[PDB]
Amino acid sequence: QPTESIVRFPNITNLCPFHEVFNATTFASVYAWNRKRISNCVADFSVIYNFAPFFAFKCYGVSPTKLNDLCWTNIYADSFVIRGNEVSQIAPGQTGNIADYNYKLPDDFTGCVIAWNSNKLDSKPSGNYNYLYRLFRKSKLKPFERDISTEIYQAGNKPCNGVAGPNCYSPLQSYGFRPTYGVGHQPYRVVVLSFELLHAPATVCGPKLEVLFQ
Amino acid sequence: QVQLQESGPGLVKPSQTLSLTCTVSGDSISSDGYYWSWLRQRPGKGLEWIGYIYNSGSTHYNPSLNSRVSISIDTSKTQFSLKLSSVTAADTAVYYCARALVLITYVWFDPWGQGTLVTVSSASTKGPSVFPLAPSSKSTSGGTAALGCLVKDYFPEPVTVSWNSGALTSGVHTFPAVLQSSGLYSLSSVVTVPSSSLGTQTYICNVNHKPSNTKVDKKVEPK
Amino acid sequence: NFMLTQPHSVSESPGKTVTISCTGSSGSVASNYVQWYQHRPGSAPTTVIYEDNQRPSGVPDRFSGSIDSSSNSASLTISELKPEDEADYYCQSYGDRNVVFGGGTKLTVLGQPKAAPSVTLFPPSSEELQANKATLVCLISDFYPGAVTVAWKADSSPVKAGVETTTPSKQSNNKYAASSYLSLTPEQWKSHRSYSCQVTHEGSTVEKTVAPT
Ligand SMILES: *[C@@H]1O[C@H](CO[C@@H]2O[C@@H](C)[C@@H](O)[C@@H](O)[C@@H]2O)[C@@H](O[C@@H]2O[C@H](CO)[C@@H](O[C@@H]3O[C@H](CO)[C@@H](O)[C@H](O)[C@@H]3O)[C@H](O)[C@H]2NC(C)=O)[C@H](O)[C@H]1NC(C)=O
Ligand SMILES: *[C@@H]1O[C@H](CO)[C@@H](O)[C@H](O)[C@H]1NC(C)=O
Ligand SMILES: *[C@H]1O[C@H](CO)[C@H](O)[C@H](O)[C@H]1NC(C)=O
Ligand SMILES: [Cl-]
């Protein structure tokens, strides 16, 4: 009664461009996290094996053991930079400033989260202030929501009239990454992969597809 | 199911190169997500990863061995091999091959070979001398009798002992070897058999010492 | 770098539950998947748990893996414990660009019933005599616990020279075995009335005798 169609399956030598996501010259600030659609390709993770000294890799809602057998309509790669001690928040069901105000994974999340330390790239001894996160918001984010407003936050009771000051903060904090910090305050690059299967022909398959051609 | 089988020399002279090979059956090596791995277990130690290779030809090896390790895939795609150079006694070990599922930091080894023991030593191989251990019905449940093989004066471990080319398995018991002051090993293998058959059935033990390429097939005659 | 540490040994009685932990240092074990391997002496190692807590088909639900980030540990837990559960168990994961194994834990299932030994004694074969050697073979099996004493006699006198005896080691059935070899010259073998292998276990003694021709 339904169908299963291979009309949009990929050429088996056409590997998903994961490496290009991972060796980007610069990553996004987490408040303005960046998303990349991956499709019409084979999701062979050998292309980023040992690409960096990875810190964490965990999947949610799908088992990594089954991944190479699986097919998807799309993969979404979100990438940003956060503090060492905030990585635990890039997972379902977390709270804290990153999970509440910057990047919120849903409870039914299906995908994986890869993180690595990038001190030697993202921290000047002068201090790299280019990386920011959102410290203040009136409310928590919805799953996969993005917020890039630079409206002055009214902490207290008196309106701020768009001018910062006592109880009126700019809502973005910088990390000021300097190489001498504790790992908790060092920069970690993060990539979140979303695996999507709508009711349509798939366009991404794991490398197990490759065996049929022998 | 995929099945893995090591094979290679029992004995390697110190500072030469260890070469092993894994034969893969029921499957072949390809760019399908799986890596192909060597590990090892040194005596009294635990499991230790060596390295693995993906069909793209990318390799990754243990840092503490990386200089001396080199893994490769045979163009038949049914074998891969390990080379480990400048070995010393500290490389004496049981070497295992395995299939590895590898994604970022997730590596899961499965299935494993049974392992092949590699001994680094300046001594030379000696084959065994095999002697019959002739029937005694003086010790066993009843209509039953024990007979056996004495596998004497060989080096290095291991020896393999089957009975009647593997057709005989119920009752077989191969005892741990003794290590003589000489530096050679000896062990015994015994099988329990029905005494009514002792006249009409031939019992042969098949001793294989792969390190010396020695096979002995000894007929154990009722004395 | 990232290391995983297990206790060297753990033991428990059959039917109870035993836990084997695997504790990280220079790293967070909850950050990367942990596997558990079972390894029985003489056998391929196999998998009891992958991906922190998944069970391959065929592994009973008595095995279960868990992760505890608060104490930076991983745990394998075995319930309804059986004597066949005796093995080394290893945890393994990854960290700092390297595969990482714990050192392994030997599991010992206690409360096993005492079992008396079987002794078989073989005399020198005629062919070994023709090669100017003489070995008497004493095979001891199926005893528990794994402690035996073996003593040899020529006629009635103790023989201490030319004896090689193994220390007991577990068989596939979870009882212990050992063997003892006495080396004579063919002239000694031929010149005594008999030789005797005497095995002692838990205060009891078995003695078997053999004689030329
Ligand atoms: C699977 O691959 C084929 C072709 O593969 C080709 O060869 C490989 C070795 C690589 O070098 C590939 O980069 C390369 O494309 C894909 O089919 C191709 O599709 C395009 C259209 O999208 C075709 O282009 C046409 O070319 C004529 C020539 O004048 C133009 O005038 C047309 O307007 C038109 O654009 C191209 O010819 C075609 N190639 C073949 C051999 O059929 C295919 O898309 C790909 N599969 C998937 C799922 O992506
Ligand atoms: C990122 O990936 C590829 C490597 O093949 C290349 O196009 C690009 O130069 C790389 N970037 C850097 C900074 O090396
Ligand atoms: C199956 O094929 C039909 C065409 O008749 C449609 O594309 C339909 O949406 C397909 N369904 C899936 C799940 O791929
Ligand atoms: Cl004496």
CSV table of C-alpha atoms in Angstrom, one decimal, chain B residues 3-190:
chain,number,residue,atom,x,y,z
B,3,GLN,CA,34.8,-15.5,9.9
B,4,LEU,CA,38.4,-14.5,10.6
B,5,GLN,CA,41.4,-16.7,10.7
B,6,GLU,CA,45.0,-15.7,11.6
B,7,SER,CA,48.0,-17.6,10.5
B,8,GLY,CA,51.7,-17.0,10.7
B,9,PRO,CA,55.0,-18.3,12.1
B,10,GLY,CA,55.1,-19.5,15.7
B,11,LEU,CA,58.7,-18.2,16.1
B,12,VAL,CA,60.5,-15.0,15.2
B,13,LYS,CA,64.1,-14.1,15.8
B,14,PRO,CA,64.7,-11.0,17.9
B,15,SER,CA,64.9,-7.8,15.7
B,16,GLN,CA,63.5,-9.4,12.6
B,17,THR,CA,59.9,-8.7,11.2
B,18,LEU,CA,56.8,-10.4,12.4
B,19,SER,CA,54.4,-11.1,9.5
B,20,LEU,CA,50.9,-12.4,10.1
B,21,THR,CA,47.8,-12.7,7.8
B,22,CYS,CA,44.1,-12.7,8.3
B,23,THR,CA,41.9,-14.7,5.9
B,24,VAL,CA,38.4,-13.4,5.7
B,25,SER,CA,35.6,-15.8,4.7
B,26,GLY,CA,31.9,-15.4,4.1
B,27,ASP,CA,32.6,-11.8,3.1
B,28,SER,CA,35.1,-9.5,1.5
B,29,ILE,CA,36.8,-6.2,2.2
B,30,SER,CA,35.3,-3.1,0.6
B,31,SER,CA,34.5,0.5,1.4
B,32,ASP,CA,31.4,-0.4,3.3
B,33,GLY,CA,32.0,1.1,6.7
B,34,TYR,CA,34.1,-1.7,8.3
B,35,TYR,CA,37.8,-1.5,9.2
B,36,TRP,CA,40.2,-4.4,9.5
B,37,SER,CA,42.2,-4.6,12.6
B,38,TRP,CA,45.1,-6.4,14.5
B,39,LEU,CA,45.3,-6.6,18.3
B,40,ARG,CA,47.3,-8.7,20.7
B,41,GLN,CA,47.6,-10.0,24.2
B,42,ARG,CA,51.0,-10.3,25.8
B,43,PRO,CA,51.5,-12.9,28.5
B,44,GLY,CA,50.0,-11.9,31.8
B,45,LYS,CA,48.7,-8.7,30.2
B,46,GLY,CA,45.4,-7.6,28.7
B,47,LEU,CA,44.0,-6.8,25.3
B,48,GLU,CA,46.0,-4.2,23.3
B,49,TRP,CA,45.0,-2.6,20.0
B,50,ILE,CA,47.7,-2.5,17.2
B,51,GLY,CA,46.1,-0.8,14.2
B,52,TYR,CA,43.5,-1.1,11.5
B,53,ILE,CA,43.0,-0.2,7.8
B,54,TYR,CA,40.0,0.9,5.7
B,55,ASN,CA,39.5,-0.2,2.2
B,56,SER,CA,40.3,3.4,1.1
B,57,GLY,CA,43.8,2.5,2.2
B,58,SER,CA,43.9,4.8,5.2
B,59,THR,CA,45.7,3.3,8.2
B,60,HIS,CA,45.7,4.2,11.9
B,61,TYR,CA,48.0,2.5,14.3
B,62,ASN,CA,48.7,2.5,18.0
B,63,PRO,CA,51.0,5.4,18.8
B,64,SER,CA,53.3,3.3,21.1
B,65,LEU,CA,53.9,1.0,18.1
B,66,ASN,CA,53.2,3.3,15.1
B,67,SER,CA,56.8,3.4,13.8
B,68,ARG,CA,57.1,-0.4,13.5
B,69,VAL,CA,53.5,-1.3,12.4
B,70,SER,CA,52.3,-1.6,8.8
B,71,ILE,CA,49.0,-3.1,7.8
B,72,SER,CA,47.8,-3.8,4.3
B,73,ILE,CA,45.0,-5.4,2.2
B,74,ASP,CA,45.6,-8.0,-0.4
B,75,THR,CA,44.1,-7.2,-3.9
B,76,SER,CA,41.9,-10.3,-3.6
B,77,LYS,CA,40.1,-8.5,-0.8
B,78,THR,CA,39.9,-11.7,1.2
B,79,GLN,CA,43.1,-11.1,3.3
B,80,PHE,CA,44.9,-8.4,5.2
B,81,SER,CA,48.2,-8.7,6.8
B,82,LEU,CA,50.3,-7.3,9.7
B,83,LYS,CA,54.0,-6.5,9.6
B,84,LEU,CA,55.8,-5.5,12.9
B,85,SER,CA,59.5,-4.8,12.6
B,86,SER,CA,62.4,-5.0,15.0
B,87,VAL,CA,60.6,-7.2,17.5
B,88,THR,CA,62.0,-8.0,20.9
B,89,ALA,CA,60.9,-10.4,23.6
B,90,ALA,CA,58.4,-7.8,24.6
B,91,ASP,CA,56.5,-8.5,21.4
B,92,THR,CA,55.8,-12.1,22.4
B,93,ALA,CA,52.0,-12.4,22.4
B,94,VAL,CA,48.8,-13.9,21.1
B,95,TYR,CA,48.0,-11.8,18.0
B,96,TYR,CA,44.3,-11.5,17.1
B,97,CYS,CA,42.6,-10.1,14.0
B,98,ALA,CA,39.2,-8.5,14.1
B,99,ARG,CA,36.6,-6.6,12.2
B,100,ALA,CA,36.1,-3.1,13.5
B,101,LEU,CA,33.0,-0.9,13.1
B,102,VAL,CA,34.4,2.7,13.2
B,103,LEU,CA,32.5,6.0,13.4
B,104,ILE,CA,34.4,9.0,14.7
B,105,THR,CA,35.3,7.7,18.2
B,106,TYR,CA,33.0,4.7,18.2
B,107,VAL,CA,35.1,1.5,17.5
B,108,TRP,CA,33.5,-1.9,18.1
B,109,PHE,CA,35.6,-5.0,17.4
B,110,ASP,CA,33.5,-7.9,16.2
B,111,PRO,CA,34.0,-10.7,15.4
B,112,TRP,CA,37.6,-11.7,16.5
B,113,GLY,CA,39.9,-14.4,15.2
B,114,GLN,CA,41.0,-17.1,17.6
B,115,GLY,CA,44.5,-15.6,17.8
B,116,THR,CA,47.9,-17.1,16.9
B,117,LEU,CA,50.7,-17.3,19.4
B,118,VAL,CA,54.0,-15.6,18.3
B,119,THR,CA,57.2,-16.2,20.3
B,120,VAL,CA,60.2,-14.0,20.0
B,121,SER,CA,63.3,-16.0,20.8
B,122,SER,CA,66.8,-16.7,19.8
B,123,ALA,CA,66.3,-20.5,20.2
B,124,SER,CA,65.3,-22.7,17.3
B,125,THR,CA,62.2,-24.8,16.8
B,126,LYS,CA,62.2,-28.4,17.9
B,127,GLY,CA,59.5,-30.9,16.8
B,128,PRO,CA,57.9,-33.2,19.2
B,129,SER,CA,58.5,-36.9,19.8
B,130,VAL,CA,55.2,-38.7,20.2
B,131,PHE,CA,54.7,-41.9,22.2
B,132,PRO,CA,51.6,-44.1,22.6
B,133,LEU,CA,49.9,-44.3,26.0
B,134,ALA,CA,48.3,-47.6,25.8
B,135,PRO,CA,44.8,-48.6,27.0
B,136,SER,CA,44.1,-49.0,30.7
B,137,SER,CA,40.6,-50.1,31.7
B,138,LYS,CA,41.7,-49.7,35.4
B,139,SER,CA,40.4,-46.2,36.0
B,140,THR,CA,37.2,-45.4,34.0
B,141,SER,CA,33.4,-45.7,34.5
B,142,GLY,CA,33.0,-49.2,33.1
B,143,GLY,CA,32.5,-50.4,29.5
B,144,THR,CA,35.0,-47.6,28.9
B,145,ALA,CA,38.8,-47.3,28.7
B,146,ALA,CA,41.4,-44.5,28.4
B,147,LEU,CA,44.3,-44.2,25.9
B,148,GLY,CA,46.5,-41.3,25.0
B,149,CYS,CA,49.5,-39.6,23.5
B,150,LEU,CA,52.7,-38.3,25.1
B,151,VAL,CA,53.9,-35.2,23.2
B,152,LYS,CA,57.5,-34.7,24.3
B,153,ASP,CA,60.3,-32.2,24.0
B,154,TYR,CA,59.1,-29.5,21.6
B,155,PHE,CA,59.5,-25.8,21.3
B,156,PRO,CA,57.8,-23.3,21.1
B,157,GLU,CA,54.2,-23.6,22.1
B,158,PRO,CA,51.7,-24.6,20.8
B,159,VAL,CA,51.0,-28.2,19.7
B,160,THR,CA,47.7,-29.2,18.4
B,161,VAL,CA,46.3,-32.7,19.1
B,162,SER,CA,43.1,-34.1,17.6
B,163,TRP,CA,42.1,-37.8,17.6
B,164,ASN,CA,41.0,-39.7,14.4
B,165,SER,CA,41.4,-36.6,12.3
B,166,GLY,CA,38.8,-34.8,14.3
B,167,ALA,CA,36.1,-37.4,14.1
B,168,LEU,CA,36.7,-38.3,17.7
B,169,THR,CA,35.9,-35.5,20.2
B,170,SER,CA,33.8,-36.8,23.0
B,171,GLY,CA,36.3,-37.7,25.8
B,172,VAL,CA,39.3,-35.8,24.5
B,173,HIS,CA,41.4,-34.0,27.1
B,174,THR,CA,44.7,-32.3,26.3
B,175,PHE,CA,46.6,-31.3,29.4
B,176,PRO,CA,48.5,-28.1,29.8
B,177,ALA,CA,52.2,-28.6,28.9
B,178,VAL,CA,55.0,-28.8,31.3
B,179,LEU,CA,58.0,-26.4,30.8
B,180,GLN,CA,61.1,-28.4,31.4
B,181,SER,CA,64.3,-27.0,32.9
B,182,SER,CA,65.8,-27.7,29.5
B,183,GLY,CA,63.5,-25.0,28.1
B,184,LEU,CA,61.4,-27.5,26.1
B,185,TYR,CA,57.7,-28.3,26.6
B,186,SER,CA,55.9,-31.6,27.0
B,187,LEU,CA,52.2,-32.5,27.3
B,188,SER,CA,49.8,-35.3,27.1
B,189,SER,CA,46.4,-35.9,25.4
B,190,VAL,CA,44.0,-38.6,26.5
